[PDB]
Amino acid sequence: GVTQTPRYLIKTRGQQVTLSCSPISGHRSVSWYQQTPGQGLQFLFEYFSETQRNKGNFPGRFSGRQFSNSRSEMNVSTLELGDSALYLCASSLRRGDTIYFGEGSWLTVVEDLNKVFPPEVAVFEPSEAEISHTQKATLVCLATGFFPDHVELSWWVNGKEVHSGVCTDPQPLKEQPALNDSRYALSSRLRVSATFWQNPRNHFRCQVQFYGLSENDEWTQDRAKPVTQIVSAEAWGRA
Amino acid sequence: MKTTQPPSMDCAEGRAANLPCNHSTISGNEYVYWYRQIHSQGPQYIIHGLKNNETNEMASLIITEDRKSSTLILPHATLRDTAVYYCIVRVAIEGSQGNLIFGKGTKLSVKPNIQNPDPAVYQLRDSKSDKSVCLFTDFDSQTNVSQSKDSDVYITDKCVLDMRSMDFKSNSAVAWSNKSDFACANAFNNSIIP
Amino acid sequence: IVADHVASYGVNLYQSYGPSGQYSHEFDGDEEFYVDLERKETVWQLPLFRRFRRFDPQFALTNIAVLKHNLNCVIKRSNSTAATNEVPEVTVFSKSPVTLGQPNTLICLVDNIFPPVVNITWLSNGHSVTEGVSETSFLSKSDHSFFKISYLTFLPSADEIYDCKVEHWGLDEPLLKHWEP
Amino acid sequence: SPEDFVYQFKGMCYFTNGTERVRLVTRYIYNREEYARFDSDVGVYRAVTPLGPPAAEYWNSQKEVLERTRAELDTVCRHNYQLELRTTLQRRVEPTVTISPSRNLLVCSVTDFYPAQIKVRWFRNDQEETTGVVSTPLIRNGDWTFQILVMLEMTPDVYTCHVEHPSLQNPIIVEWR
């Protein structure tokens, strides 16, 4: 499969960003795409035999290279706020064959680092009305006030991550839809049997993985540096 | 682009999804490609063909004899098949020879089949501390959960969880606000039982 | 093989000397176009082709890059078996019956060229001519050799002496082929 | 002389009776040795010399490479031929016919014509000249025009050169005299 690094990035206006991509073993053609909610999925450039082939309609700020091992590295210079997007890399055995995409690199260009906030996580215990009416117990997790949208939510019961009966919102909700760098909110639901919730030994924890600033960034603010962290909220069962 | 697709298309779970696509300006040297993208993940390659009908383990492609339109046939529609489906013609044009230019695509929503739809709105208390959320759940898949008028009130969209331990599926939406006057009775009040 | 029309939709050439390459399409033995690999431009050889036909030069550059890779492998696989220098034959003639004062064209056909590294020039009264000298690309042959044609637009006069000098690795000396009227 | 390593890839299409019989043969040539080829009549890559077992067996294993090369019978050969019908197969350059005494031998210089199908006949006085007529093979000028020179040994009478060509519904008849 196609691999892309880094997975999440936070940069400010004026900086540059290098995006790596390891293609499928044996593939020699690599194409770069940019996916925005506005203009959709746009083509950037394609590389084969260390040289660029077809090129999109992007400014010279968006450049790229291809090495002998068919690996590619995309670069963007003088980052603008509109450059924040998911940058996807695709590979094919040769130029003209079926291209296969990777997972992409999430880039978020911020006005300043002060706009990065970690999420606060809250767990809401199921209601007795749902327990008595349906014999099922729904727990709701709430991750609020985080920016950017580089978050991974997961449910952990008794130490093991669960996926049955788990539903997380596909897209977060902006707390202030008018602001550009508005903080987000995300909800998730874990529904279990009423008896499983009524067992006082069952431990329910909602884990939210946040990707933020690294050590290469300076934090001149008084609040805690919004570095990559796991914010968790837990709840025990009760009869 | 050379392809036109229906912007949105609904389908019931277990049924066969026939995603149409028109491309009357295609040429004899251009292939038809189909891709899908689940959520904000990487686009997944489905199938491709030239003029014959192709079939892989994922779907079947039916191209007309005059090659002016095609159809992607997903026989066994699962809830994991809810994604944006892109019908792309890999063009043979100068400056874009061999490029896959994505269009708007088709948003395919695989509606699950709720056997006993008993809709109800419950209020959940916080596990630590004055905080509470409203939960609208167990409603039929043919119902819409609209956004909130009050910006201080936040309402999420429909979410389908699958309790594999009992083969039970259920839609659910959440609402919350800081204004303590938030009664869960008048929370999703923009959602009337049709 | 028997056919009414033969088309060479892809005469891809790449040689280690240079290194140089060539991509061109041929139909019935006539070059439709060649792709200038340095300027990334398709050069059609007929006005009718330039207005109705199109070809992306990026497809040509990609195939030549594959030829560069494929050449390095068959070199290692064949124990570095170099090519064999062939003896090219040269023919000079006019395009139309020469009439004094009416502009004509001299045609220098250099056949059986291998490797495709030939140096063809014209001489007038012993002087090298650098005006009106056109040149085709390396046109393929069924025996996988090449032939190249050089042109010289001129004005027929009484005291005219035209010779086509051809320089090749298969020749011991530069071959001077005089044009008999 | 410096050493040279030549590689050639010829994507050749063969047409017969319009689009009734279309054949695709892609030839892979090291120097002047074709070591591997793909024949659409065969449908799979085959090695021509012991220099391409590694290439033919490897390209036949790549399913998409084999299927796309198979589909080039329609995406390249058949598709490009439709553009030839709009351009190349409609090119009709009428031949220029000139009779001139050689410097006795009369020559009939038929120059600058397309396509290659042509016919030239000599007539001494409405009687066709068979012997004494020496022709040349068709000459390819390289600029999409052909040329042919048909000479006739003569001894003086109205010598006539007739020329037929697809671009001519009327055969060109030129008298020397």
Partner: peptide
């Protein structure tokens, strides 16, 4: 503008 294509070449083992 629509362009015609030539024969595609494959990459050897190496």
């Amino acid at each position: 503008g629509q362009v015609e294509l030539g024969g595609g070449t494959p990459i050897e083992s190496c």
